[PDB]
Design a protein around this motif. Structure first.
Motif, PDB file in Angstrom:
ATOM      1  N   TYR A  89       0.845  -1.191   0.000  1.00  0.00           N
ATOM      2  CA  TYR A  89       0.000   0.000   0.000  1.00  0.00           C
ATOM      3  C   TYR A  89       0.881   1.242   0.000  1.00  0.00           C
TER       4      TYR A  89
ATOM      5  N   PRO B  86      -3.449   7.375  -3.439  1.00  0.00           N
ATOM      6  CA  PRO B  86      -3.284   6.159  -2.638  1.00  0.00           C
ATOM      7  C   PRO B  86      -3.748   4.933  -3.397  1.00  0.00           C
TER       8      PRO B  86
ATOM      9  N   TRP C 274      -6.105  -1.989   2.749  1.00  0.00           N
ATOM     10  CA  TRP C 274      -6.798  -0.700   2.706  1.00  0.00           C
ATOM     11  C   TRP C 274      -7.177  -0.236   4.111  1.00  0.00           C
ATOM     12  N   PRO C 275      -7.055   1.073   4.385  1.00  0.00           N
ATOM     13  CA  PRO C 275      -7.441   1.555   5.718  1.00  0.00           C
ATOM     14  C   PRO C 275      -8.899   1.237   6.046  1.00  0.00           C
TER      15      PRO C 275
ATOM     16  N   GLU D 120     -12.460   3.313   5.201  1.00  0.00           N
ATOM     17  CA  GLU D 120     -12.236   4.334   4.187  1.00  0.00           C
ATOM     18  C   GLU D 120     -12.635   3.806   2.815  1.00  0.00           C
ATOM     19  N   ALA D 121     -13.230   4.663   1.998  1.00  0.00           N
ATOM     20  CA  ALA D 121     -13.569   4.284   0.636  1.00  0.00           C
ATOM     21  C   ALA D 121     -12.446   4.660  -0.324  1.00  0.00           C
ATOM     22  N   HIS D 122     -12.812   4.933  -1.578  1.00  0.00           N
ATOM     23  CA  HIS D 122     -11.871   5.333  -2.632  1.00  0.00           C
ATOM     24  C   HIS D 122     -10.845   4.243  -2.930  1.00  0.00           C
TER      25      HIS D 122
END
Ligand SMILES: C[S@@+](CC[C@H](N)C(=O)[O-])C[C@H]1O[C@@H](n2cnc3c(N)ncnc32)[C@H](O)[C@@H]1O
Ligand SMILES: C[S@@+](CC[C@H](N)C(=O)[O-])C[C@H]1O[C@@H](n2cnc3c(N)ncnc32)[C@H](O)[C@@H]1O
Ligand SMILES: Nc1nc2c(c(=O)[nH]1)N[C@@H](C(=O)O)CN2
Ligand SMILES: Nc1nc2c(c(=O)[nH]1)N[C@@H](C(=O)O)CN2
Ligand code: SF4
Ligand code: SF4
Ligand code: NA
Ligand code: NA
Ligand code: NA
Lengths: 209, 209
Positions: B9, B21, B77-78, B81-83
């Motif tokens: 990541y 990101p 992925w965090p 969180e989306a995106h």
């Protein structure tokens, strides 16, 4: 009449358009700092990396009308090439950028970008609107193409900015004695909150104007 | 079954999405080079800056199915969180990237980018297609989102690439002993032919994965 510090042809170093050939039109004067070092410590915006005082830079001067200014801007574009693109900056460009200049640039085939601190209304006929909010100034421009936030600033409400009506949300590390520190902060912010993307000042790494 | 060199990541260092990101899924193996130094001199692609040999990198391995691979990708992925965004690379990802993996990534809410040498057909359900043509290899992918050409290469018809069907046309300086030289060539190219924009390998300047 337009007071212009400098006009030059280079690659946009910052934001979503980083890497793109552009004529930079740097207007003289800002509403958040006089540009005098004596005033910096008390200014609304105190971290500025730019010389925007006077009209004595490359191609700088006082232009009597929009046509005169467009002619100089157009003259820097490679002959026979399209994709004309101009970045209006400063200084605070919205102190001077008006509909007649916007119209004349468009009629000369230019796409228009602006770099603005967001404390003043922007002309919505501008093609690419980049807003870089200063923590201790009013923010009246709440929609645009990219919101490019220089970090860290005290009093900043960074997550709140992501609520605004922009296509891109960027953080740009504050250059100065702590650039490398601020760059790590910015990278970490984006990785934690991936709505945000990093804007490097790439022209400082490439050492180009 | 998928052979993956590493999964990590970070921020996308390159191209139009630089600064964004992303989880990088680096597939093992390429069709233009074995990845062995003793073969580099005779390879179709000779300038590679990447280790794509084996499955021994961070999170690397042999994945049973698409669901196992997506689980590892999503895990980086965090939380909350989306995106979500994954860059499929390698190696040549089109040796392995198939529709079930694409569908699984999409079902997990990921936007998908690919980095591909353009010598193999691509899945057009991929959201962001970056093609980086190798001058001595066939180019069978002639449309996509960005065409990111590494320069200089011998046998290159660089200007002609601009006739293909891409949204962005980029030149990326070839890293190696002449990086600063090639960076100057690339800047000059864009300024001379402003349809083209510069793609820096920003992760190498930022010193991040
Ligand atoms: C010089 S300002 C001129 C345009 C307008 N006055 C503004 O502030 O957006 C152009 C860009 O440089 C950024 N900038 C200024 N000083 C900086 C610094 N020390 N480090 C990083 N970015 C900086 C500003 O925030 C802005 O995005
Ligand atoms: C390692 S390749 C993997 C994906 C696929 N094999 C390709 O070539 O596009 C990822 C990206 O790095 C670029 N690249 C490889 N070696 C490079 C080098 N020495 N300098 C600059 N970019 C390089 C490639 O052209 C490609 O755009
Ligand atoms: N290459 C390059 N890009 C820039 C700048 C600059 O000084 N050089 N200055 C910034 C500005 O003052 O608007 C925007 N991006
Ligand atoms: N941060 C970062 N960005 C990258 C790369 C890489 O190794 N790191 N490698 C490139 C790739 O191999 O696809 C694309 N962009
Ligand atoms: S508002 Fe923009 S031009 Fe004015 S001092 Fe701040 S960074 Fe510099
Ligand atoms: S085609 Fe891509 S992965 Fe293969 S050797 Fe060339 S740059 Fe490396
Ligand atoms: Na500047
Ligand atoms: Na790489
Ligand atoms: Na060449």
């Amino acid at each position: 009449t337009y007071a212009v510090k400098e006009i030059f042809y280079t690659l946009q170093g910052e934001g979503a358009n980083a890497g793109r050939p552009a004529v930079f039109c740097r207007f003289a004067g800002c509403n958040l700092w006089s540009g005098r070092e004596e005033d910096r410590a008390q200014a609304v915006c105190r971290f500025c990396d730019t010389d925007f005082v006077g009209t004595d830079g490359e191609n700088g001067g006082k232009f009597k009308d929009a046509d005169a200014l467009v002619a100089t801007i157009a003259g820097l574009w490679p002959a026979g090439e399209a994709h004309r693109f101009v970045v209006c900056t400063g200084g605070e460009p919205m102190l001077q950028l008006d509909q007649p200049l916007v119209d004349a640039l468009h009629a000369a085939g230019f796409g228009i970008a602006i770099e603005t601190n967001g404390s003043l209304p922007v002309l919505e006929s501008i093609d690419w609107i980049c807003v870089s909010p200063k923590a201790d100034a009013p923010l009246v421009v709440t929609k645009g193409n990219e919101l490019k936030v220089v970090i860290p600033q005290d009093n900043q409400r960074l997550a709140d900015y992501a609520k605004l009506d922009f296509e891109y949300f960027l953080v740009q590390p504050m250059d100065g004695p702590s650039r490398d520190l601020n760059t790590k902060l910015a990278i970490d912010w984006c990785k934690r909150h991936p709505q945000w993307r990093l804007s490097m000042q790439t022209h400082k790494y490439l050492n180009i104007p």
